[PDB]
RNA sequence: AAGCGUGUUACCUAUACUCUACCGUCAGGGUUGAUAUGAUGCCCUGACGAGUAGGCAGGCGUGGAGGUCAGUGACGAAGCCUAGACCGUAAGGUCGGGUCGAACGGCCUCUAGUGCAGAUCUUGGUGGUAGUAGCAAAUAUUCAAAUGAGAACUUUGAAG
RNA sequence: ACUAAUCGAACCAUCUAGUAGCUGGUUCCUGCCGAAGUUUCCCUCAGGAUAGCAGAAGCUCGUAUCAGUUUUAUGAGGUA
RNA sequence: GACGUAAGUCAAGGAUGCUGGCAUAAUGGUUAUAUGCCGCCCGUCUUGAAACACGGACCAAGGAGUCUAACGUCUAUGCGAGUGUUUGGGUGUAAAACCCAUACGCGUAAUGAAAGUGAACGUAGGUUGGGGCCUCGCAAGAGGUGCACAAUCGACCGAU
RNA sequence: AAAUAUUGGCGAGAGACCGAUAGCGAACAAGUACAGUGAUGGAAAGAUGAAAAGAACUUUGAAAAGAGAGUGAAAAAGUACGUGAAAUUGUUGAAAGGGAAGGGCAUUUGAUCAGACAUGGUGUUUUGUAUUUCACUGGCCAGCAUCAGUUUUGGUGGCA
């Protein structure tokens, strides 16, 4: 609200919290990112390194649809199964009856391997996968299949 | 007229009362203020000064971290006290039976703990069951893990995270960060 | 409500006083005050009247009777501080003064009902002045000029200095 | 009457007036801090007006107390007055200025019945 | 010497030092098995208190909103004046008196076009200057009668 | 020079509340703390950024990894 | 604590006892004046203002760090690996309120210029300090566990 | 076609908006008076009273107008009209006054103002039993004695 603003506490003080000799002006240092190379150079090379210059090629007509690759680590892999049926799959590890976790329809493109899934069979449906993500799945007895 | 070596009328700089308005969170402080004062147990003094911490200083403690605390030998039967919230975790799939006293439990944490055979209580049950912190164990959530801390202490050659909205190419990856253009940090 | 309420009402009970550690020790008097000496009244109706100190009451006042037939001062009590003790003395081992004490000089019992909005001596006060003065006038005659000295008042003349004047 | 109290020491009875309040009619008498970079008042020069400070703060045990020793209470009607029934010793009644005359005679009669002391009984009478 | 050089003591006084009271801040504490209006309260101890720019905290006030006091008021609201009174350190609050005529308060919160001595500030108004400067170029008016309450200024006449 | 009392570029309205590192002003109280005019860079010297000095929010602990200090011992200096 | 065999008393963790007058303008308050001393005219620029520096004849009213998009730190609250109803729909006493789906936003993974790759040897590692707890210990104190955190050496991921 | 925009026009409904220097420039005969050759610029000005019931009539004055009377709840509502602030001005009163005045500390002098306790009050025979027909104390101001804290000024004794 306005009543808690320090302006209400600054009534009566001539400079309104801006200094007698500073004389708060409109734009004493410039407008926006002005003087990024001349008189604010120390700021722009200390607090914001790397602002000025080229880097990398220019991607023409970039679409974030192509680069939609949300990552699903193996720890979260068991969140895909609804919590009601997680237990009946966590217990009774069955090779011929393994839950079919479909990561894609939940919106996950790539399976990473942050690891430590319990050693029970599991079915993983993902467009991509990392090398170590497989090995933990196989070390748990699961299999990875390719879908797109 | 005396010289003053230190700054006079210097406030102690520590929170003395929770400057939250919460009445229930002041009832707990009222209880523990009495316990901390009327007991010699250092545990009550600790929990009293942990109830005042702000939200950033009361980080969530995962039930995975609760389990890691119980992995210590001699702590299997100890109760766990978390002055703050207790959020659950999908990372752990086996949870040992235990009792946890925390300000707030997420619904996910209660379901995970109680189903695991444990039990969830608050600080007042903890006071009833153990006034002076018998066989207790205080856990604190990680504090530098906050995203606001990656940018703290920013400077050249510090390995910190610049304050920036959009992260990617064309944003702080030019002269001043790479050695090819200009210089390196 | 014009002014809502103060919750923290003060302690309406009255707290008893603490046990004060002050007794009432007997008054000690300056060496210049000896029974039968001659004082000089400083303040009151009889300022400057010479008088004879008789007895020290338990009400830390001085019972004095400048012989009423001499200086017109009755057998009355005065304050020890408001009198100057003169070196001269009158021997007084022949006067009975025991019957005069605090309750004797009690004025009267006065309340707001007896309010003298607009504005008599007891016969005892006269006879007791006589019997007390009988010893005084009998044993004051032997020393010459004292009766004249006692009759006259006292006042600071010009050119004299009360500090270097010994009384 | 009221409870026994410490002697009422005001410790500054003179009202704090603004600097040059009489000199200019536009300068209100109400005390406003002289925040001038050159004002002799703000620098506490000798022989000048004294600035309000804590030191003039009155004794707590005799703060808000009238010279009669009663903390005044602003009463509006009979119902407000009945709150001070047992609290007659400390709090003294005070009829609000806007209470009508026919509404004062009822309060004064009621207040006089309870023995609560009223500091404006000479207010808005009829003779 | 009431000058100079020197020394002896006596003495005078800072918001300095000591002690005391009071205030505020800070710190360290005490205070719940029928004990206290039930805890940002109360109480104890101690040390401090200069201050521009500046920071922060606690408060007073103004316009309006939600709630409450079954609040105040034509037997007199608001407003205004008040070398009348009280309260608060203070911002201010409250009362008493007069004018006055129709609405307005207290408290918990909410909100903002929220507090003026200044900006050669704006608008309006009023002053000292001050019954003052000024009403002095164009040669010039005078008498009488009439009208009229009133005639240097109007007529009319006579003159110039 | 003159171009409607306006002229080394008229006047009127708008863009326009043009821009200002410059001048003046910036409205209640109390309480606590309380400076700086120096480093470096800038077409920089009436201004900024950055470090410094200050406040606040605190946080971790509980007499120390301390100190505008001295002693002891051991260095260094090239002023008087 | 003292004096007292003791009972008690006391100058021992802060004043009592007695007495007198008055009970009102007496004390005191406000205000005017006088007297002693002191006080330069305020605001601002300034190293420096009473300035022979500038603004201010006086009075009333108006009058200046606001709002917003996006954020940073801090804080509070709700939920918490999720979070966000209010683009929209249903509803309604109708701009209110209530309810709701999918998406989408931020977060959960980083790195590289990009192609791409993508985080446990170990009890998620070791070492040191580490509040607290626990075992013994009357008590210090000794051990065990030691989250947060601080430093460092590691280990894994991306890039060269 | 619809979903969309709409500070113009017409109608309608609302507001945590403004309240006669505000809000449209314009609450009123406002784009009016007025200024400018012209383009254009462009104000100020709301409120008697319920009702004009708008002061008949008498008297002074030439008349305005005054004094009355009177209407009116009010003329402290008379169209120069709700309330009517300050600057500024007059009258009366009070005070002061040797080239300023004003302010602070302190007190006199004068003017003026709140208050006790004048309490059921430690009770006392009521005229066919709730008036205690004399009360306890604090309200102001002081004095004395004994003390305590701080201090000052001395007289003495003993000892080294």
UniProtKB/Swiss-Prot annotation, chain A:
Protein name, as recorded: Large ribosomal subunit protein uL15
Gene3D superfamilies linked: 3.100.10.10
Effect caused by changing residue 37 to E: Confers resistance to cycloheximide, an inhibitor of polypeptide elongation
HAMAP family named among the record's database cross-references: Ribosomal_uL15
UniProt crosslink position (Glycyl lysine isopeptide (Lys-Gly) (interchain with G-Cter in ubiquitin)): 95
Residue ranges annotated as motif Nuclear localization signal: 6-12, 23-29
GO MF: RNA binding; structural constituent of ribosome
Matches recorded under PROSITE patterns: RIBOSOMAL_L15
Keywords recorded for this protein, A-Z: Cytoplasm, Isopeptide bond, Ribonucleoprotein, Ribosomal protein, Ubl conjugation
Subunit record text: Component of the large ribosomal subunit (LSU). Mature yeast ribosomes consist of a small (40S) and a large (60S) subunit. The 40S small subunit contains 1 molecule of ribosomal RNA (18S rRNA) and 33 different proteins (encoded by 57 genes). The large 60S subunit contains 3 rRNA molecules (25S, 5.8S and 5S rRNA) and 46 different proteins (encoded by 81 genes).
Superkingdom, taxonomy of origin: Eukaryota
Family: Belongs to the universal ribosomal protein uL15 family.
Disordered as annotated region, ranges: 1-38
Swiss-Prot record, chain B:
InterPro entries in UniProt: Ribosomal_eL18, Ribosomal_eL18/eL18-A/B/_CS, Ribosomal_uL15/eL18, Ribosomal_uL15/eL18_sf
Biological process terms in GO annotation: cytoplasmic translation
Any GO CC annotation of this UniProt entry: cytosol
Localization of this protein: Cytoplasm
Matches recorded under Pfam families: Ribosomal_L18 (PF17135)
Coiled coil (UniProt feature): none
SUPFAM superfamilies: Ribosomal proteins L15p and L18e (SSF52080)
Gene3D superfamilies documented for this protein: 3.100.10.10
Modified residues (N6,N6,N6-trimethyllysine): 49
Cross-link Glycyl lysine isopeptide (Lys-Gly) (interchain with G-Cter in ubiquitin) per UniProt, renumbered positions: 115
Keyword terms of this UniProt record: Cytoplasm, Isopeptide bond, Methylation, Ribonucleoprotein, Ribosomal protein, Ubl conjugation
Highest taxon above the source species: Eukaryota
GO molecular function, one term: RNA binding
Subunit annotation: Component of the large ribosomal subunit (LSU). Mature yeast ribosomes consist of a small (40S) and a large (60S) subunit. The 40S small subunit contains 1 molecule of ribosomal RNA (18S rRNA) and 33 different proteins (encoded by 57 genes). The large 60S subunit contains 3 rRNA molecules (25S, 5.8S and 5S rRNA) and 46 different proteins (encoded by 81 genes). eL18 interacts with NAP1.
Note from the entry: There are 2 genes for eL18 in yeast.
Role: Component of the ribosome, a large ribonucleoprotein complex responsible for the synthesis of proteins in the cell. The small ribosomal subunit (SSU) binds messenger RNAs (mRNAs) and translates the encoded message by selecting cognate aminoacyl-transfer RNA (tRNA) molecules. The large subunit (LSU) contains the ribosomal catalytic site termed the peptidyl transferase center (PTC), which catalyzes the formation of peptide bonds, thereby polymerizing the amino acids delivered by tRNAs into a polypeptide chain.
PANTHER family: 60S RIBOSOMAL PROTEIN L18, LARGE RIBOSOMAL SUBUNIT PROTEIN EL18
Annotated family: Belongs to the eukaryotic ribosomal protein eL18 family.
Record's protein name: Large ribosomal subunit protein eL18A
Species for this entry: Saccharomyces cerevisiae (strain ATCC 204508 / S288c) (Baker's yeast)
Taxonomic lineage: Eukaryota, Fungi, Dikarya, Ascomycota, Saccharomycotina
Curated annotation (Swiss-Prot), chain C:
Pfam families for this protein: Ribosomal_L6e
One GO BP: cytoplasmic translation
Domain of life: Eukaryota
Alphabetic keyword roster: Acetylation, Cytoplasm, Isopeptide bond, Phosphoprotein, Ribonucleoprotein, Ribosomal protein, Ubl conjugation
One GO CC annotation: cytosol
GO MF terms held by the record: RNA binding; structural constituent of ribosome
Localization (cell): Cytoplasm
Record-listed Phosphoserine modification sites: 11
InterPro entries reported in the protein's UniProt record: 60S_ribosomal_eL6, Rib_uL2_dom2, Ribosomal_eL6_CS, Ribosomal_eL6_KOW, Translation_prot_SH3-like_sf
Post-translation changes: N-terminally acetylated by acetyltransferase NatA.
N-acetylserine modification, residue list: 1
Presence of keyword Cytoplasm: yes
PANTHER family for this protein: 60S RIBOSOMAL PROTEIN L6, LARGE RIBOSOMAL SUBUNIT PROTEIN EL6
Quaternary structure and partners: Component of the large ribosomal subunit (LSU). Mature yeast ribosomes consist of a small (40S) and a large (60S) subunit. The 40S small subunit contains 1 molecule of ribosomal RNA (18S rRNA) and 33 different proteins (encoded by 57 genes). The large 60S subunit contains 3 rRNA molecules (25S, 5.8S and 5S rRNA) and 46 different proteins (encoded by 81 genes).
Family the UniProt entry places it in: Belongs to the eukaryotic ribosomal protein eL6 family.
Miscellaneous section: Present with 37100 molecules/cell in log phase SD medium. There are 2 genes for eL6 in yeast.
Summary of the function given for this chain in its UniProt record: Component of the ribosome, a large ribonucleoprotein complex responsible for the synthesis of proteins in the cell. The small ribosomal subunit (SSU) binds messenger RNAs (mRNAs) and translates the encoded message by selecting cognate aminoacyl-transfer RNA (tRNA) molecules. The large subunit (LSU) contains the ribosomal catalytic site termed the peptidyl transferase center (PTC), which catalyzes the formation of peptide bonds, thereby polymerizing the amino acids delivered by tRNAs into a polypeptide chain.
Protein name (Swiss-Prot/TrEMBL): Large ribosomal subunit protein eL6A
Name of the coding gene: RPL6A
């Amino acid at each position: 609200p306005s009543r808690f603003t320090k302006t209400r506490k600054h009534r009566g003080h001539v400079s309104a919290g801006k200094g007698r000799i500073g004389k708060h002006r409109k734009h004493p240092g410039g407008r926006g990112m002005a003087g990024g190379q001349h008189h604010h150079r120390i700021n722009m090379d200390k607090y914001h390194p790397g602002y000025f210059g080229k880097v990398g090629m220019r991607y023409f007509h970039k679409q974030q649809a192509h680069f939609w690759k949300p990552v699903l680590n193996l720890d979260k892999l068991w969140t895909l199964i609804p919590e009601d049926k997680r237990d009946q799959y966590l217990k009774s590890a069955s090779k011929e009856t393994a839950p079919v976790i479909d990561t894609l329809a939940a919106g996950y493109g790539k399976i990473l391997g942050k690891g430590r899934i319990p050693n029970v069979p599991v079915i993983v449906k993902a467009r991509f996968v990392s090398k170590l993500a497989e090995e933990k799945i196989r070390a748990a007895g699961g299999v990875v299949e390719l879908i797109a | 007229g005396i010289d003053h070596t230190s700054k006079q009328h210097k406030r102690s700089g520590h929170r003395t009362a929770p400057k939250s308005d919460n009445v229930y969170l002041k009832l707990l402080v009222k209880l523990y203020t009495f316990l901390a004062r009327r007991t010699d147990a250092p545990f009550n003094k600790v929990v009293l000064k942990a109830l005042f911490l702000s939200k950033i200083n009361r980080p969530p403690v995962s039930v995975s971290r609760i389990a890691r605390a119980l992995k210590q030998e001699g702590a299997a039967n100890k109760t766990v006290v978390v002055v703050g919230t207790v959020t659950d975790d999908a990372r752990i799939f086996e949870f040992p039976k235990t009792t946890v006293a925390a300000l707030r439990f997420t619904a996910g944490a209660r379901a995970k703990i109680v189903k695991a055979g444990g039990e969830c209580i608050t600080l007042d049950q903890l006071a009833v069951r153990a006034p002076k912190g018998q066989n207790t164990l205080i856990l604190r959530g990680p504090r530098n893990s906050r995203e606001a801390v990656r940018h703290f202490g920013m400077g050249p050659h510090k390995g910190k995270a610049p304050r920036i909205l959009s992260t990617g190419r064309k944003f702080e990856r030019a002269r001043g960060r790479r050695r090819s253009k200009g210089f390196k940090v | 409500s014009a002014q809502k309420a103060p919750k923290w009402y003060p302690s309406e009970d009255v707290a008893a006083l603490k046990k004060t550690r002050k007794a009432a020790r007997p008054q000690k008097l300056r060496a210049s005050l000896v029974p039968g000496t001659v004082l000089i009244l400083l303040a009151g109706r009889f300022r400057g009247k010479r008088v004879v100190y008789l007895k020290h009451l338990e009400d830390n006042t001085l019972l004095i009777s400048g012989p009423f037939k001499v200086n017109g001062v009755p057998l009355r009590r005065v304050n020890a501080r408001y009198v100057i003790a003169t070196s001269t003395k009158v021997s007084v081992e022949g006067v009975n003064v025991e019957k005069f004490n605090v309750e004797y000089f009690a004025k009267e019992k006065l309340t707001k009902k007896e309010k003298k909005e607009a504005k008599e001596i007891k016969a005892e006060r006269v006879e007791d002045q006589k019997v007390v003065d009988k010893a005084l006038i009998a044993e004051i005659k032997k020393t010459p000029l004292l009766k004249q000295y006692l009759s006259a008042s006292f006042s600071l003349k010009n050119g004299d200095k009360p500090h270097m004047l010994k009384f | 009457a009221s409870l026994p109290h410490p002697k009422i020491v005001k410790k500054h009875t003179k009202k704090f007036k603004r600097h040059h309040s009489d000199r200019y009619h536009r300068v209100a008498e109400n005390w406003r801090k002289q925040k001038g970079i050159d004002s002799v008042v703000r620098r506490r020069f000798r022989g000048n007006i004294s600035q309000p400070k804590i030191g003039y703060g009155s004794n707590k045990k005799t703060k808000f107390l009238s010279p009669s020793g009663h903390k005044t209470f602003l009463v509006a009607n009979v119902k407000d007055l009945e709150t001070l029934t047992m609290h007659t010793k400390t709090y003294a009644a005070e009829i609000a200025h806007n209470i009508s005359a026919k509404n004062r005679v009822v309060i004064l009669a009621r207040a006089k019945a309870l023995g609560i002391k009223v500091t404006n009984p000479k207010g808005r009478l009829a003779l």
